[PDB]
Every structure is written in C-alpha cells, then in structure tokens.
Design a protein around this nucleic acid. Structure first.
Ligand SMILES: [Mn+2]
Ligand SMILES: [Mn+2]
Ligand SMILES: [Mn+2]
Ligand SMILES: [Mn+2]
Ligand SMILES: [Mn+2]
Ligand SMILES: [Mn+2]
Ligand code: NA
Length: 325
DNA sequence: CGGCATACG
DNA sequence: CGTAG
DNA sequence: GCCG
C-alpha cells in the first residue's frame, strides 16, 4: 500500500465503509477544533481503508498500512470487537460537534465563524435567523436556502443544469465548452452541489467570459444568489410543479490550463492535497489548478490532458472514478 | 522535530 | 473572513 | 496523528 493517496486507486464504493466513516468523524471533529494535522492523518487513514481490496476483519491486517498508528488502530480494534468506538460515539452526541457541523454546513460559514457563534451561546439556525444584523449577504443566502441545499442533487438534476449552462455559455461565447467536474465526474450518483469547467479552444478567447455567462443566467431568472474566474452561485432548478435551490460552481480556464483545472476541480479534496504534496515533496514540482512549475529550471509543464500530468509526475494514470480518496 | 496543498472571491 | 477541489 |  503506497503512502500517498494519489498512488493508489480509490473507488467510490468499497469494503470498509463503516471503519472509514468512523475515522472520518474523528477527522471532522479535529477540524472543528483547528487541529489540521490530526484531521489529515484521520482522513488519510480512512482513505487507506477505502483502497483495500477486501474487508478488514482482524487487527493484524492493519500492520504495515500507512497512517495507522496507536490511535487509528485502536479505533478499528474497538469497532471490530464491539461494533462501536466509544470515542467516536462521544463525538457524535456532543453538543459541540453537532452544532459545529450544523453551522459549518451553512454556505458562508466556516469553522472560525461557527466557533465564534458557538462561544456566543448560539446553537440553532433559528438562533442565527433572530439576529440577521450579524450575517453577511452570503450567509443570509445560505440560511434562506439551507433546507434545499441540504437535499441531495440527483443526476437528472445535473443534466438539466448542464443544458441551461451550455445555452448561456453558447450565447456568451460561441465555441466555448462546458465540462461537468467535481463528485459527479468521479461517478457519484448524488451530490450536494454541481461543478462546471468552461473553456474555449482558442487560447485567450475565454477572457472576460464569466461575467457574460452570469449576466445571461441572471437575465433568465435562474440565479438566486451570486457574488473573475470562479462563481459560487445558487441556481433555481425547476422541479415537478415547483423548483429548488441548488449550489452550482462555474469556473473558467484558458485551454492551456484546462487539464490542470479539470484535475483540480475533479478532486477529491484529499486526492488533490495528496497529489500536490507528492508533487512537491517527492518530485520537487509545484502543482495547482493552473499548472505545474519546475522551480529549478523556472518552467511550466505544458499539458494537453490529465494523462500528461500523471506522466510528468511519474504516477500511474487514475481515471476520475478511482480518485475517490 | 517540522510538515501537513494551494489557489480565488 | 468566505469559497473550491 | 502520523511519517520520514
Ligand atoms: Mn474492548
Ligand atoms: Mn462539488
Ligand atoms: Mn461545488
Ligand atoms: Mn487564474
Ligand atoms: Mn512537532
Ligand atoms: Mn489554483
Ligand atoms: Na460553510
């Protein structure tokens, strides 16, 4: 088992679901306390289990696996022996965890804002609604639409959104293309948001495109909220006899950068952090969603595909459906 | 022990 | 500070 | 919390 998640296939569904979910509770709780290091370790240990070819049945099977030390191994041992881990259950039913999770899941609210609200005694969404004076425009939108935004987005929803985005993009710039990214590109059947990457085959024609796209969507009455190259919107998606709010991200990249932006926006989050860590620490190259930089020769690697990028990093190619780290 | 990814709005 | 993957 |  390789030590970096970008070195191993990770499918969407796997053979250690319960174990990985428990470790990801502890990872999330570490984040709510600001312990980014512990969050990462628990996230990586969870992802190792997702990559295994069969169920862990015995503690012996953890020996030699990367990111399993005393703590993550104890968690697994208790779940193997009792079907529950007392630490995990204590986190689950703690008022701190429940409230931080409820608050941070609001669009516009991060750990730091949720933490300050928690320290102020706030616990519920209606607590936040009673003092709108204390909210940003973005948070007011996230709270107004919170119920819809908590409802799973389905693939049928995605196909309808993509057609309307393509129609606005085609008017903004003939020849521009729309690619579905994020978790749907990794094969998920449901999601909590939809992500699109927009480019044009003639380098430079994409400049100025996103304002033109947004203005057209707004004029069609489709934009419930928006605020450049990245747009974090809330779309009005028609539904049987009604509609629902859906989070949509629209991103523009020049075709020279498109492989890097595709790679980054396709995720997963952990996969991209691990890929960039691997790039820098093992290969001495600096990766982001714009490009891959050699800091010794001071040159950018030209890529025509994701396959190019994996090759330039010395990694076996992984299709999106195996990047579910 | 230091590191933990790296951007944009 | 928020957002993204 | 774990790795190197
Ligand atoms: Mn026991
Ligand atoms: Mn997404
Ligand atoms: Mn998104
Ligand atoms: Mn840019
Ligand atoms: Mn230390
Ligand atoms: Mn970037
Ligand atoms: Na949030």
């Amino acid at each position: 088992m390789p030590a970096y998640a970008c070195q191993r296939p990770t499918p969407l569904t796997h053979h250690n679901t319960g174990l990985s979910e428990a470790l990801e509770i502890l990872a999330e709780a570490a984040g709510f306390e600001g312990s980014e290091g512990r969050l990462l370790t628990f996230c990586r240990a969870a992802s190792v289990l997702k990559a295994l070819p069969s169920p862990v049945t015995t503690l012996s099977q953890l020996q030699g696996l990367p990111h399993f030390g005393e703590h993550s191994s104890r968690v697994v041992q208790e779940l193997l022996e009792h079907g529950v881990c007392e630490e995990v259950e204590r986190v689950r039913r703690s008022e701190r965890y429940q409230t931080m999770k409820l608050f941070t899941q609001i669009f516009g609210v991060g750990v730091k804002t949720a933490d300050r609200w928690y320290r102020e005694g706030l616990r519920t969404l209606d607590d936040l609604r009673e003092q709108p004076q204390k909210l940003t425009q973005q948070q007011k939108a996230g709270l107004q639409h919170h119920q819809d935004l908590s409802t799973p987005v389905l693939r049928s929803d995605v196909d309808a959104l993509q057609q309307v985005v393509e129609e606005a993009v085609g008017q903004a710039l003939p020849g521009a293309t729309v690619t579905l990214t994020g978790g749907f590109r990794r094969g998920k059947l449901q999601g909590h948001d939809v992500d699109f990457l927009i480019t044009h085959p003639k380098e430079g024609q994409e400049a100025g495109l996103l304002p033109r796209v947004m203005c057209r969507l707004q004029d069609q009455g489709l934009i419930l909220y928006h605020q450049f190259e990245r747009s974090f919107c809330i779309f009005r998606l028609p539904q049987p006899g009604s509609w629902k709010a859906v989070r949509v991200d629209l991103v523009v990249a020049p075709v020279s950068q498109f492989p890097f932006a595709l790679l980054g926006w396709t995720g997963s989050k952990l996969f991209q952090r691990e890929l960039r860590r691997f790039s820098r620490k093992e290969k001495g190259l600096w990766l982001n969603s714009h490009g891959l930089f050699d800091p010794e020769q001071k040159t950018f690697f030209q890529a025509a595909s994701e396959e190019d990028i994996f090759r330039h990093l010395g990694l076996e190619y992984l299709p999106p459906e195996q990047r579910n780290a």
